[PDB]
Amino acid sequence: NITDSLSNRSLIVTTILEEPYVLFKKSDKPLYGNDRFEGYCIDLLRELS
Numbered sequence: 001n002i003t004d005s006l007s008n009r010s011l012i013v014t015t016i017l018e019e020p021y022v023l024f025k026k027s028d029k030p031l032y033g034n035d036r037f038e039g040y041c042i043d044l045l046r047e048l049s
């Protein structure tokens with residue numbers, strides 16, 4: 001239950017925008033916050049969250 005173990009833990013992740021791991025989100029209208037990104041590391045961080 002590592003899903004239940006880390007609640008109430010707002011964490012801050014930084015990254016570098018050069019990779020195919022993170023190269024924003026492909027859409028006509030830009031989103032904001034964590035939802036404006038996509039890639040290997042972004043959906044990987046969504047999987048880990």
Ligand SMILES: *[C@@H]1O[C@H](CO)[C@@H](O[C@@H]2O[C@H](CO)[C@@H](O)[C@H](O)[C@H]2NC(C)=O)[C@H](O)[C@H]1NC(C)=O
Pocket residue numbers: 004005006007008
């Ligand atoms: C986040 O905070 C809430 C506050 O309600 C926690 O909920 C309680 O968590 C404890 C265990 O830490 C349980 O024993 C209680 O039954 C829960 N409810 C009550 C009555 O508060 C929640 O678990 C916390 N989440 C974390 C820290 O991961």
Ligand SMILES: *[C@@H]1O[C@H](CO)[C@@H](O)[C@H](O)[C@H]1NC(C)=O
Pocket residue numbers: 001
């Ligand atoms: C996590 O907790 C849930 C309770 O809803 C339980 O069903 C599940 O088996 C737990 N996960 C592990 C790996 O024990």
